[PDB]
Design an enzyme around this catalytic site. Sequence first.
Site, PDB file in Angstrom:
ATOM      1  N   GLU A   1       0.865  -1.187   0.000  1.00  0.00           N
ATOM      2  CA  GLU A   1       0.000   0.000   0.000  1.00  0.00           C
ATOM      3  C   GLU A   1       0.896   1.231   0.000  1.00  0.00           C
ATOM      4  O   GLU A   1       1.286   1.706   1.067  1.00  0.00           O
ATOM      5  CB  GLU A   1      -0.961  -0.061   1.214  1.00  0.00           C
ATOM      6  CG  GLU A   1      -1.692  -1.400   1.234  1.00  0.00           C
ATOM      7  CD  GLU A   1      -2.880  -1.487   2.146  1.00  0.00           C
ATOM      8  OE1 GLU A   1      -3.237  -0.497   2.813  1.00  0.00           O
ATOM      9  OE2 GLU A   1      -3.493  -2.579   2.165  1.00  0.00           O
TER      10      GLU A   1
ATOM     11  N   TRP B   1     -12.572  -8.113   4.807  1.00  0.00           N
ATOM     12  CA  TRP B   1     -11.650  -7.578   5.804  1.00  0.00           C
ATOM     13  C   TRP B   1     -12.514  -7.229   7.018  1.00  0.00           C
ATOM     14  O   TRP B   1     -13.292  -6.274   6.967  1.00  0.00           O
ATOM     15  CB  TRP B   1     -10.892  -6.348   5.315  1.00  0.00           C
ATOM     16  CG  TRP B   1      -9.915  -5.949   6.384  1.00  0.00           C
ATOM     17  CD1 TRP B   1     -10.170  -5.180   7.484  1.00  0.00           C
ATOM     18  CD2 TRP B   1      -8.564  -6.400   6.513  1.00  0.00           C
ATOM     19  NE1 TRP B   1      -9.039  -5.095   8.278  1.00  0.00           N
ATOM     20  CE2 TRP B   1      -8.045  -5.847   7.698  1.00  0.00           C
ATOM     21  CE3 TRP B   1      -7.736  -7.210   5.729  1.00  0.00           C
ATOM     22  CZ2 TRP B   1      -6.734  -6.071   8.113  1.00  0.00           C
ATOM     23  CZ3 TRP B   1      -6.449  -7.440   6.143  1.00  0.00           C
ATOM     24  CH2 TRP B   1      -5.954  -6.870   7.329  1.00  0.00           C
TER      25      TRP B   1
HETATM   26  C1  LIG Z   1     -10.566   6.367  -2.132  1.00  0.00           C
HETATM   27  C2  LIG Z   1      -9.233   6.436  -1.342  1.00  0.00           C
HETATM   28  O1  LIG Z   1      -8.179   6.422  -1.908  1.00  0.00           O
HETATM   29  N1  LIG Z   1      -9.304   6.492   0.040  1.00  0.00           N
HETATM   30  C3  LIG Z   1      -8.101   6.542   0.904  1.00  0.00           C
HETATM   31  C4  LIG Z   1      -8.195   5.383   1.929  1.00  0.00           C
HETATM   32  O2  LIG Z   1      -8.011   4.212   1.200  1.00  0.00           O
HETATM   33  C5  LIG Z   1      -7.069   5.478   2.995  1.00  0.00           C
HETATM   34  O3  LIG Z   1      -7.337   4.528   4.003  1.00  0.00           O
HETATM   35  C6  LIG Z   1      -6.540   3.353   4.051  1.00  0.00           C
HETATM   36  O4  LIG Z   1      -7.004   2.485   3.031  1.00  0.00           O
HETATM   37  C7  LIG Z   1      -6.387   1.194   2.952  1.00  0.00           C
HETATM   38  C8  LIG Z   1      -7.080   0.398   1.789  1.00  0.00           C
HETATM   39  O5  LIG Z   1      -6.556   0.889   0.602  1.00  0.00           O
HETATM   40  C9  LIG Z   1      -6.485   0.453   4.303  1.00  0.00           C
HETATM   41  O6  LIG Z   1      -5.604  -0.627   4.249  1.00  0.00           O
HETATM   42  C10 LIG Z   1      -6.011   1.369   5.479  1.00  0.00           C
HETATM   43  O7  LIG Z   1      -6.276   0.771   6.733  1.00  0.00           O
HETATM   44  C11 LIG Z   1      -6.761   2.733   5.460  1.00  0.00           C
HETATM   45  N2  LIG Z   1      -6.204   3.632   6.470  1.00  0.00           N
HETATM   46  C12 LIG Z   1      -7.015   4.248   7.435  1.00  0.00           C
HETATM   47  C13 LIG Z   1      -6.316   5.174   8.430  1.00  0.00           C
HETATM   48  O8  LIG Z   1      -8.191   4.072   7.478  1.00  0.00           O
HETATM   49  C14 LIG Z   1      -7.029   6.937   3.597  1.00  0.00           C
HETATM   50  C15 LIG Z   1      -5.826   7.117   4.596  1.00  0.00           C
HETATM   51  O9  LIG Z   1      -6.052   8.238   5.375  1.00  0.00           O
HETATM   52  O10 LIG Z   1      -6.926   7.909   2.593  1.00  0.00           O
HETATM   53  C16 LIG Z   1      -8.002   7.908   1.663  1.00  0.00           C
HETATM   54  O11 LIG Z   1      -7.703   8.853   0.715  1.00  0.00           O
HETATM   55  C1  LIG Z   2      -6.257  -6.396   2.550  1.00  0.00           C
HETATM   56  C2  LIG Z   2      -6.366  -5.058   3.354  1.00  0.00           C
HETATM   57  O1  LIG Z   2      -7.429  -4.570   3.617  1.00  0.00           O
HETATM   58  N1  LIG Z   2      -5.174  -4.470   3.758  1.00  0.00           N
HETATM   59  C3  LIG Z   2      -5.095  -3.173   4.521  1.00  0.00           C
HETATM   60  C4  LIG Z   2      -5.226  -3.380   6.075  1.00  0.00           C
HETATM   61  O2  LIG Z   2      -3.946  -3.132   6.587  1.00  0.00           O
HETATM   62  C5  LIG Z   2      -6.251  -2.426   6.744  1.00  0.00           C
HETATM   63  O3  LIG Z   2      -6.459  -2.791   8.107  1.00  0.00           O
HETATM   64  C6  LIG Z   2      -5.710  -2.107   9.056  1.00  0.00           C
HETATM   65  O4  LIG Z   2      -4.452  -2.760   9.151  1.00  0.00           O
HETATM   66  C7  LIG Z   2      -3.558  -2.090  10.042  1.00  0.00           C
HETATM   67  C8  LIG Z   2      -2.166  -2.789   9.945  1.00  0.00           C
HETATM   68  O5  LIG Z   2      -1.678  -2.699   8.653  1.00  0.00           O
HETATM   69  C9  LIG Z   2      -4.163  -2.140  11.477  1.00  0.00           C
HETATM   70  O6  LIG Z   2      -3.357  -1.385  12.318  1.00  0.00           O
HETATM   71  C10 LIG Z   2      -5.569  -1.497  11.496  1.00  0.00           C
HETATM   72  O7  LIG Z   2      -6.150  -1.688  12.746  1.00  0.00           O
HETATM   73  C11 LIG Z   2      -6.451  -2.225  10.436  1.00  0.00           C
HETATM   74  N2  LIG Z   2      -7.738  -1.577  10.289  1.00  0.00           N
HETATM   75  C12 LIG Z   2      -8.914  -2.331  10.317  1.00  0.00           C
HETATM   76  C13 LIG Z   2     -10.196  -1.510  10.152  1.00  0.00           C
HETATM   77  O8  LIG Z   2      -8.926  -3.503  10.494  1.00  0.00           O
HETATM   78  C14 LIG Z   2      -7.599  -2.578   5.954  1.00  0.00           C
HETATM   79  C15 LIG Z   2      -8.814  -1.814   6.603  1.00  0.00           C
HETATM   80  O9  LIG Z   2      -8.586  -0.418   6.611  1.00  0.00           O
HETATM   81  O10 LIG Z   2      -7.449  -2.163   4.617  1.00  0.00           O
HETATM   82  C16 LIG Z   2      -6.159  -2.106   4.027  1.00  0.00           C
HETATM   83  O11 LIG Z   2      -5.646  -0.863   4.352  1.00  0.00           O
END
Ligand SMILES: CC(=O)N[C@@H]1[C@@H](O)[C@H](O[C@@H]2O[C@H](CO)[C@@H](O)[C@H](O)[C@H]2NC(C)=O)[C@@H](CO)O[C@H]1O
Ligand SMILES: CC(=O)N[C@@H]1[C@@H](O)[C@H](O[C@@H]2O[C@H](CO)[C@@H](O)[C@H](O)[C@H]2NC(C)=O)[C@@H](CO)O[C@H]1O
Lengths: 369, 369
Positions: B119, B339
């Site tokens: 990511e 997830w």
């Molecule tokens: C549409 C878009 O790009 N949204 C962004 C979010 O995806 C992003 O959140 C992060 O997304 C990941 C999946 O691609 C998750 O693994 C990750 O946990 C999640 N992070 C949080 C803090 O929720 C956010 C990050 O701020 O930005 C958006 O732009």
């Molecule tokens: C496959 C997938 O969704 N990957 C990403 C995950 O990492 C993310 O979950 C977040 O992962 C973090 C560690 O990398 C954790 O600290 C955090 O708690 C966890 N968040 C949740 C809601 O489980 C998920 C979900 O945001 O999406 C991607 O960004």
Amino acid sequence: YNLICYFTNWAQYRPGLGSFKPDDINPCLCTHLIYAFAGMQNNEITTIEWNDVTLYKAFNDLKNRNSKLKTLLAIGGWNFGTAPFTTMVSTSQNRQTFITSVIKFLRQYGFDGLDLDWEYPGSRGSPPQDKHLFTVLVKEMREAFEQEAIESNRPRLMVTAAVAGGISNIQAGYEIPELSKYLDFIHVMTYDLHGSWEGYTGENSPLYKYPTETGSNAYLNVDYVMNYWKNNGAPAEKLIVGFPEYGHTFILRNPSDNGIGAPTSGDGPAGPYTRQAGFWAYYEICTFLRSGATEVWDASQEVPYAYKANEWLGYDNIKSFSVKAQWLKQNNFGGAMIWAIDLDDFTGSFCDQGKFPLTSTLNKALGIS
Amino acid sequence: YNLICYFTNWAQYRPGLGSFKPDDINPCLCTHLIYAFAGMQNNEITTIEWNDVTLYKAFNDLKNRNSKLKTLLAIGGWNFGTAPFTTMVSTSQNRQTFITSVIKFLRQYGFDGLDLDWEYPGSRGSPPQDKHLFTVLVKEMREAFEQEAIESNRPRLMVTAAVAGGISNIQAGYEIPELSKYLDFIHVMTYDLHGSWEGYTGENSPLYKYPTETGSNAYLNVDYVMNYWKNNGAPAEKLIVGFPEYGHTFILRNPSDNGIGAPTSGDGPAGPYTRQAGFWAYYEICTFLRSGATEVWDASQEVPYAYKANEWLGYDNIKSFSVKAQWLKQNNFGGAMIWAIDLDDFTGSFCDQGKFPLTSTLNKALGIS
Ligand SMILES: CC(=O)N[C@@H]1[C@@H](O)[C@H](O[C@@H]2O[C@H](CO)[C@@H](O)[C@H](O)[C@H]2NC(C)=O)[C@@H](CO)O[C@H]1O
Ligand SMILES: CC(=O)N[C@@H]1[C@@H](O)[C@H](O[C@@H]2O[C@H](CO)[C@@H](O)[C@H](O)[C@H]2NC(C)=O)[C@@H](CO)O[C@H]1O
Ligand SMILES: CC(=O)N[C@@H]1[C@@H](O)[C@H](O[C@@H]2O[C@H](CO)[C@@H](O)[C@H](O)[C@H]2NC(C)=O)[C@@H](CO)O[C@H]1O
Ligand SMILES: CC(=O)N[C@@H]1[C@@H](O)[C@H](O[C@@H]2O[C@H](CO)[C@@H](O)[C@H](O)[C@H]2NC(C)=O)[C@@H](CO)O[C@H]1O
Ligand SMILES: [Mg+2]
Ligand SMILES: [Mg+2]
């Protein structure tokens, strides 16, 4: 004596000459054929392969060429786990749903009985109350089968069970004295006694303990396991000794250390037909031996092993099947069961020992034909 | 269809009823289980948690309870960032170090493949060339996996990837037509589409756009994201729709202003079990709904939201999972991924919808069992 032969409904998918279906079975080899496996859905017995109904027909049609042959359907198996059994036995209603479904299923498709293969009550996630609830299930099934014989005017369906060979699993799982009153036969799985999971070489189904084995390591042999069942409540005449027509494979850590107990690494090589790390069918074993593997007779345990470079094999052959058949007869057991007939050299074209060399050895030793 | 379920190795640390380990997984719910996460050291895959080896064994033992189940190990995730990936793909030697370590690691510990969760390539500090070098890594890994299967007589290891749902990240990160050829499955993270980072309320995984949206806000829905992937080179059958079993939380600036797009002042409070501000597990959501929250159906987007005083929640429930499952099936996608299964009401004690209500909804809708 009885000779009980398991057939597996996934052998059909093996490549080339490994593909095996019921019409490949010689109907005169065994006294009982057991079909592995049925499954369970919503507490009712079910098929699990798209063509099971077709294979059931071909399987039970083997009785057209042997009037003495009986067939059973086995439910469960190793890869079935425990959770559906635990749910099914947890209430009287769930047990009756299951037993009723079994009666209808066996009568519809031509089976003479059910082989319960729960591996195992009280282990692998099954809670402790399942030890007694398994007894309840078997008792209720035996009674239901007695009643259905009354209601249908047919000979009663048999109820058998495949049971653990490991002592801890036996102690956690089976009320042997009571269970033995209601089962018709007890198929003791006296194999997988050693394997790559232990981290060193050992035999799949040794008759006797290795001379240096003490304590719980001395449980891991056919003699101890069968006598454990016999001396804890099961009549010898109901006890059926398990015979494997496969062996377990290992990777030696050092090829110069190649005896019993030599250290191993990883899960063991896979064969081109069975395609599962850690075991080879007997016909795959023959290809290993013929290619120049070193063969050793493990004299204390009455079984062979073989090795080639860093590959090590613990297995059974005609000689070990013969010795163990003599042993079970002299100890007054009810006969033998084989896992599984589709692992024998059923075409006779791998081992140069005739068709079904291992199964034919037991057929001869037990006076079946 | 496939139902791909992520399990997280930090769910074990949640208090009381929230503590989740692999034995809490119903092995029959999913077709694939993915273990989140492994790490990386010196360009080789590695464990992260003190007890990962024990959890790996419990996880891959689930395949001994469902013969159809496959397991994968995921590397990366949100917190992993990008720097180790950038270094690892920068040279053919580092890629080979990684690939070789992965084959050894997956076979040693019992996994059926690797899920790449970077990511993201080309974002979050990763330089522009990582877009192409990610394709190269996947092609080289797929080729290595194909050869290993031939040499080992075993089913080939899978390579999959979790990929961005945000359009700018997609454009900066992925060569979609070439990448799609070599990946077995493409796990599209169609969630986190809105969150408190934006400063107003919005849904976590809405199916369709909100009626007022006309700008780049119209990209932020499952329909658009999946069709972006499909129409830019990915076959529908390899595309897997992401389903979140959690919702995002927000603090409302003005509690009476509580619809979609209402102004917010940050993340909601950490749940008692998941203990991270900004989201709640589905089982925590069920408790919120029983605490005096108002539930609203966002009819245009096919998802619920809820609020209580200054707390606002955008989430998914049985109804929204059902609608989106119907949709994905009509579009011939490969299935769904979740997830994460440890965020479902796995005990059944919070939602009065049975055990694993959200995951069971998809299992039923996709005909998995
Ligand atoms: C549409 C878009 O790009 N949204 C962004 C979010 O995806 C992003 O959140 C992060 O997304 C990941 C999946 O691609 C998750 O693994 C990750 O946990 C999640 N992070 C949080 C803090 O929720 C956010 C990050 O701020 O930005 C958006 O732009
Ligand atoms: C496959 C997938 O969704 N990957 C990403 C995950 O990492 C993310 O979950 C977040 O992962 C973090 C560690 O990398 C954790 O600290 C955090 O708690 C966890 N968040 C949740 C809601 O489980 C998920 C979900 O945001 O999406 C991607 O960004
Ligand atoms: C009567 C009996 O032996 N039952 C068990 C069998 O299931 C087991 O065979 C294994 O069955 C699995 C399905 O449950 C197959 O996936 C697996 O390939 C097969 N293994 C072998 C070596 O044939 C046998 C043998 O281990 O013993 C019991 O465990
Ligand atoms: C003495 C003992 O308990 N040995 C265990 C083995 O039985 C067990 O293997 C499994 O044995 C079943 C028969 O009871 C077979 O149906 C099943 O196929 C077989 N499983 C495998 C992978 O071979 C192994 C499992 O790791 O543990 C031994 O401790
Ligand atoms: Mg030596
Ligand atoms: Mg208002």
